[PDB]
Chains A and B, each alone.
Chain A
Amino acid sequence: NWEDADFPILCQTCLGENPYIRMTKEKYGKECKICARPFTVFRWCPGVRMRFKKTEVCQTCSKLKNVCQTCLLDLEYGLPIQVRDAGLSFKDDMPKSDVNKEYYTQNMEREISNSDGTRPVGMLGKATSTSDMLLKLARTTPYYKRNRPHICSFWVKGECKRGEECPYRHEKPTDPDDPLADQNIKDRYYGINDPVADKLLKRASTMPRLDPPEDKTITTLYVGGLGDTITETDLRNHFYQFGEIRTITVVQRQQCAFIQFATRQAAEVAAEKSFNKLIVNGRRLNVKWG
């Protein structure tokens, strides 16, 4: 089918830093880079020195995979699709071969048009269960360096006869001796071998995490960074969630708090939930084993 929708699905670092945006709507302008069925192309200018970005994929190919239509990054977290599927499950399995892709597209678009038109169709129930490591490397500030005109290919040959009037950049292109420079559109879409996603998951592997007990059954918790502006009667209230809490040794001369629970399971938990995440009394509460 065609698509024919109003107001595209965009993030905030592609839609520009101006709250006042002019965009044009073309009814069936291009085809999708994934679906190859034609859609409504929206085209705007992000800012002042930017590139005139436009939407690349359908409303449907962004409903299936919860991304922005031009940068193909997540709407909520802003990370590549392979990273978000790595920090979640992968149960979409969109077909890549031709006839199966258009058949699956027709049927999932029928499922979309047999619904409200507001939610991620299959990604919702798995989007309830969230806040993995992907929340701990999500970019806080907008990356406005994407919205930036291409390298002038006449200036690379030293023949840019426009000079100062050329809107294209006179600066270095990136070295092709780089994994970060292949980057197919469909490889970035389907979550297959995206090198940006490789570097983000590698950064992710390094990152701090809750760990297992050195010895069996030990529910002893070695808590560093307590501080003397807190009270131990509240800890219990913020801890009871887990189960009956075993031993609760308290030391304020090192500001370390040792804890004990019935089962080791609960102690692992309290690490997991607790490690590099929990803060109470506006003060970070750091945890270790033994």
Chain B
Amino acid sequence: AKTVTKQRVESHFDLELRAAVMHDILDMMPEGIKQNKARTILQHLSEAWRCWKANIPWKVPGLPTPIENMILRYVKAKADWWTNTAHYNRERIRRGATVDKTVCKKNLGRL
């Protein structure tokens, strides 16, 4: 049972975020839904995250408000994780602590 060490961290976070969204949309759909359409909502969530990072205002013209609110909720959660990781690595790069070179490039790109 492999450990999430240092190079699995973002892939494990984005692995678990998808699972939480899957459980929420399986609980959120009412009783007579065809139980398809999970992949499309996951793509809407990935596109909403890209539009958050690009500072593009994200609005789908027809979309149910529980799905739209849930996507906004999880996009705010990934925003918080992204931003707090950026603050932490910037304080580390400022003090001179042991940092990777890739985390310096990633941190510049986030800042």
Q: In their complex, do chains A and B touch, with some C-beta pair under 8 Å? A: no
